[PDB]
Amino acid sequence: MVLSEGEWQLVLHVWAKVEADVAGHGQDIHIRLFKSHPETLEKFDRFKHLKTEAEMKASEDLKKLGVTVLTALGAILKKKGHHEAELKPLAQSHATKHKIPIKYLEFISEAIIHVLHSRHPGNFGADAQGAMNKALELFRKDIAAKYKELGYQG
Ligand code: HEM
């Protein structure tokens, strides 16, 4: 798939707002993911024990991880589809070290969309949401293709 420049503009415009508070957005997104799909929390040996949202908010390690995640995703989005180099190490660790199924990448995409809709309604109307969804679908499609080449595809 290919996004138009107008669609990229909508994506980078709301992302610029997210970048005003990377740590906060990182936390909201992960808490949303863990509360909505608890099975995803099992993949983090480091955080598996967290029982409540209060404990999640209090975790400094979880906050650090959220920043790392959003920083990596932001770097990919800013490439506007030319993200081959950035995708390789990400696909390798998630397929072979962490073993993260494509399904879980769809769950976090839902969490990202939920949080942006909630925090940035004025910059996340229907058109902007469609553009972000398209960007994340492109990301998942390319990651899935890489998973297959790496021998995991799941
Ligand atoms: C927007 C999608 C995602 C991005 C950009 C992302 C990015 C990263 C990055 C950059 C790291 C650190 C270096 C590395 O190991 O590659 C990381 C670690 C990790 N990721 Fe992801 N990730 C994503 C989604 C997921 C999902 C959905 C899961 C699990 C449900 C997951 C589980 C892990 C685990 C277990 C680690 C190691 C955490 C630790 O150090 O304790 N990732 N991820």
mmCIF file of N, CA, C and O in Angstrom, residues 4 21 25 34 38 71 84 89 106 123 141 143 145:
data_model
loop_
_atom_site.group_PDB
_atom_site.id
_atom_site.type_symbol
_atom_site.label_atom_id
_atom_site.label_comp_id
_atom_site.label_asym_id
_atom_site.label_seq_id
_atom_site.Cartn_x
_atom_site.Cartn_y
_atom_site.Cartn_z
ATOM 1 N N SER A 4 -0.689 8.817 0.386
ATOM 2 C CA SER A 4 -0.468 10.049 -0.358
ATOM 3 C C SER A 4 0.265 11.020 0.575
ATOM 4 O O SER A 4 0.317 10.805 1.794
ATOM 5 N N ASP A 21 4.851 15.289 24.615
ATOM 6 C CA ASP A 21 4.898 14.517 25.868
ATOM 7 C C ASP A 21 5.036 13.016 25.538
ATOM 8 O O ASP A 21 4.097 12.232 25.713
ATOM 9 N N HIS A 25 2.388 9.834 26.713
ATOM 10 C CA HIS A 25 1.663 9.081 25.704
ATOM 11 C C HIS A 25 2.085 7.608 25.771
ATOM 12 O O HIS A 25 1.246 6.733 25.620
ATOM 13 N N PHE A 34 -2.484 -3.231 27.971
ATOM 14 C CA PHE A 34 -2.493 -4.210 29.059
ATOM 15 C C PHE A 34 -3.871 -4.399 29.694
ATOM 16 O O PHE A 34 -4.242 -5.519 30.073
ATOM 17 N N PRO A 38 -4.904 -8.287 28.349
ATOM 18 C CA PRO A 38 -4.027 -8.758 29.426
ATOM 19 C C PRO A 38 -2.996 -9.802 29.013
ATOM 20 O O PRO A 38 -1.905 -9.870 29.585
ATOM 21 N N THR A 71 9.633 6.382 20.411
ATOM 22 C CA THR A 71 10.760 6.973 19.689
ATOM 23 C C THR A 71 11.044 6.132 18.429
ATOM 24 O O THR A 71 11.269 6.681 17.347
ATOM 25 N N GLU A 84 12.581 0.604 5.360
ATOM 26 C CA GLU A 84 13.242 -0.694 5.271
ATOM 27 C C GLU A 84 14.361 -0.874 6.321
ATOM 28 O O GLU A 84 14.362 -1.846 7.075
ATOM 29 N N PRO A 89 16.001 -4.467 12.237
ATOM 30 C CA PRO A 89 16.321 -4.886 13.607
ATOM 31 C C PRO A 89 15.091 -5.082 14.484
ATOM 32 O O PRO A 89 15.077 -5.952 15.370
ATOM 33 N N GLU A 106 -1.518 -5.620 16.129
ATOM 34 C CA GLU A 106 -2.823 -5.040 15.821
ATOM 35 C C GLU A 106 -3.432 -4.468 17.116
ATOM 36 O O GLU A 106 -4.025 -3.391 17.104
ATOM 37 N N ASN A 123 -7.296 17.275 16.340
ATOM 38 C CA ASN A 123 -6.326 16.922 15.312
ATOM 39 C C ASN A 123 -6.467 15.448 14.949
ATOM 40 O O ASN A 123 -5.591 14.863 14.295
ATOM 41 N N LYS A 141 1.958 -4.661 7.744
ATOM 42 C CA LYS A 141 2.124 -5.454 6.527
ATOM 43 C C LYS A 141 3.610 -5.700 6.243
ATOM 44 O O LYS A 141 4.016 -6.829 5.960
ATOM 45 N N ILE A 143 6.120 -5.439 8.397
ATOM 46 C CA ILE A 143 6.714 -6.220 9.489
ATOM 47 C C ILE A 143 6.354 -7.699 9.274
ATOM 48 O O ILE A 143 7.196 -8.582 9.485
ATOM 49 N N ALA A 145 5.772 -9.223 6.483
ATOM 50 C CA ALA A 145 6.567 -9.740 5.372
ATOM 51 C C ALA A 145 7.971 -10.111 5.856
ATOM 52 O O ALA A 145 8.506 -11.154 5.476
#
